[PDB]
C-alpha cells in the first residue's frame, strides 16, 4: 500500500545461510521495504540446509530455485517479479554464481518487467512510460550507431504512408524547440525547384526536423531530448507533449522515433528494432543490446554485405535474435539506391558520399534494377567548386545526375547541377532484402501496422 516497495531480493548458496537471513530480516524490518519473495539463483558451496522448504520456513520467506544451480534461473526470476509486480529487485549475491555478463541479462528481464535491478553499487531504472496516445502505434529504435536506424525508419513511414494508414511521426531528436513543432512533410514536394528553397533553412535550423520530414514525406511532430542512457531513457524530453499534439491532427497512426539509443518514453503496440550487422558482437549479445531485441515485433538487420560484415557474422546474428526474441519476424537487409522518378535508358551521373569499395555495387544495382547507364560518380556533394569541376567532365554525357535526397544535397548538389543545367532525380537510401528465404520487407512492416491496429481496437 502507500509507497511501500515491494522487493524481490536475489540470493545464493555460496553464502553461509545466517548471513543471508540477516540481510533479508534487515530488509523485511526496514520502512518503507516490503520483501515479497526471495530467488535463490545458484551455488551450493556453502548450503548446510539440503531441504528447501526448510531453507523457505527458516528465511520466512517464498523461496524460489531454479532446477539447475550451476546457472542463473532467469524464468524464475521474470515469472516473481511478475507474480508480485515487484517495484525492485535487490541482488544479493557475488561471484561465482553472478558475473558482470550474468548481471545484464538479469537487468534485462526485470527492466523489462518495469522493475528497478539494484546491487551494492549499482541501479538500473526501467524506462519512462507515458500512456498518452490514442491512435494505434509502433516505436522504431536501433541497438547502436552506424546501422542506418534513420534510413530504415524514414523506409517504414513512407510504405506505411503508400498502404494508405495516414501516419503521422514523433520525432525525438537532437535539436528544436521548446513547444514541439509540426512539420507538414506531406505538402513537400520531392523536386529541384520546390526543394530549392526550403533545405537551406533546414541546414541552418537548430534541429534536423526539416530532414526527417524531407526523408519521411509525412506530418511530422518535431520533439528533442538531451543524451540517452544505456537501456534508453533520456534525462529531459517535450515528446509527451508531442504525442499529445499527434493524437490531434489529421492522421491515423502514429510512428515514434528517437535519436541514438534514446527510447521514446511514450506506450506503443508494436515495436520495430534495427540492427546492425556491421556492430561490434558485444553491443549486440551484451550489455542492452538483448533487452532492446527482445522488444522486437520485427527486427531489421542491416549492412547485412562485405565489407560491413562476413556471412559468418551476419549468421551469428541471425542466430542470436532467434534465440533471445524466436517470436519477432527478423529480415536482413543491405542499402541500396531507389530512385524518385524515372531513370529507365537515361544516362546518369550519380552523386553519391558511398565508400569507393560499395560504389561497383550500387551502379551495378542501379543499371540492373533501374535499367540506367551510370556514365560517372561523383563524391563532392558538399562543394560547390569541386562539384562545378566533376560536371565539366560529365555536362555533354550525362542526362541527369541522380542524388541521395538530404537537406545537405539540396543546397549545394541540387543548386549546382541546375545552374549547369543538368536534370536531377533524387534517390533515397532504402534498406533491401539480401535473402528470399526471409521475407517481403514492405510486408513485413505492414504486418506490424495490422498487429498494432487490432491491439488498439482489442484494448479499445
Ligand atoms: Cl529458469
Ligand atoms: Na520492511
Redesign the pocket.
Given at each position: 500500500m502507500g509507497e511501500t516497495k515491494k522487493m524481490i531480493c536475489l540470493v545464493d548458496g555460496e553464502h553461509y545461510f545466517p548471513v543471508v537471513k540477516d540481510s533479508i530480516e534487515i530488509?523485511?524490518?526496514?520502512?518503507?521495504?516490503?520483501?515479497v519473495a526471495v530467488v535463490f539463483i545458484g551455488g551450493t558451496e556453502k548450503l548446510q540446509i539440503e531441504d528447501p522448504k526448510e531453507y523457505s520456513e527458516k528465511l520466512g520467506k517464498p523461496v524460489f530455485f531454479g532446477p539447475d544451480p550451476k546457472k542463473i534461473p532467469y524464468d524464475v526470476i521474470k515469472k516473481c517479479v511478475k507474480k508480485y509486480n515487484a517495484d525492485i529487485v535487490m541482488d544479493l549475491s557475488d561471484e561465482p554464481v553472478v558475473d558482470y555478463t550474468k548481471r545484464f541479462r538479469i537487468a534485462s528481464i526485470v527492466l523489462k518487467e518495469g522493475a528497478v535491478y539494484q546491487g551494492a553499487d549499482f541501479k538500473f531504472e526501467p524506462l519512462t512510460e507515458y500512456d498518452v496516445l490514442e491512435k494505434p502505434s509502433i516505436k522504431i529504435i536501433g541497438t547502436g550507431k552506424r546501422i542506418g536506424k534513420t534510413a530504415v525508419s524514414a523506409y517504414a513511414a513512407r510504405v506505411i504512408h503508400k498502404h494508405k494508414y495516414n501516419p503521422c511521426v514523433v520525432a525525438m531528436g537532437r535539436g528544436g524547440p521548446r513547444e514541439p513543432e509540426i512539420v507538414e512533410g506531406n505538402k513537400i514536394e520531392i523536386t529541384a525547384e520546390y526543394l530549392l528553397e526550403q533545405a537551406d533553412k533546414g541546414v541552418h535550423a537548430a534541429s534536423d526536423h526539416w530532414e526527417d520530414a524531407l526523408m519521411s514525406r509525412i506530418l511530422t511532430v518535431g520533439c528533442r531530448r538531451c543524451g540517452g542512457g544505456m537501456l534508453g531513457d533520456t534525462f529531459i524530453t517535450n515528446v509527451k507533449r508531442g504525442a499529445e499534439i499527434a493524437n490531434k491532427l489529421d492522421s491515423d497512426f502514429v510512428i515514434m522515433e528517437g535519436s541514438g539509443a534514446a527510447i521514446p518514453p511514450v506506450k506503443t503496440n508494436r515495436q520495430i528494432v534495427t540492427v546492425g550487422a556491421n556492430q561490434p558482437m558485444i553491443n549486440i549479445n551484451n550489455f542492452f543490446g538483448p533487452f532492446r531485441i527482445g522488444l522486437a515485433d520485427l527486427v531489421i538487420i542491416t549492412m547485412c554485405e562485405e565489407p560491413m560484415a562476413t556471412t559468418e557474422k551476419i549468421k551469428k546474428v541471425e542466430k542470436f535474435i532467434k534465440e533471445i526474441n524466436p517470436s519477432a519476424n527478423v529480415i536482413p537487409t543491405v542499402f541500396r539506391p531507389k530512385p524518385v522518378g524515372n531513370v529507365e535508358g537515361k544516362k546518369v551521373l550519380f552523386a553519391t558520399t558511398a565508400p569507393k569499395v560499395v560504389v561497383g555495387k550500387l551502379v551495378n544495382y542501379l543499371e540492373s534494377k533501374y535499367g540506367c547507364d551510370v556514365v560517372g560518380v561523383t563524391p563532392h556533394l558538399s562543394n560547390r567548386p569541386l562539384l562545378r569541376r566533376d560536371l565539366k567532365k560529365y555536362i555533354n554525357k550525362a542526362d541527369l545526375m541522380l542524388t541521395e535526397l538530404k537537406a545537405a544535397a539540396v543546397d549545394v548538389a541540387t543548386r549546382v547541377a541546375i545552374e549547369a543545367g543538368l536534370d536531377v532525380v533524387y534517390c533515397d537510401n532504402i534498406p533491401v532484402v539480401i535473402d528470399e528465404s526471409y521475407g517481403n520487407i514492405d510486408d513485413a512492416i505492414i504486418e506490424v501496422v495490422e498487429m498494432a491496429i487490432d491491439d488498439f481496437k482489442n484494448n479499445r
Open positions: 530488509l523485511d524490518d526496514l520502512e518503507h521495504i516490503d520483501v
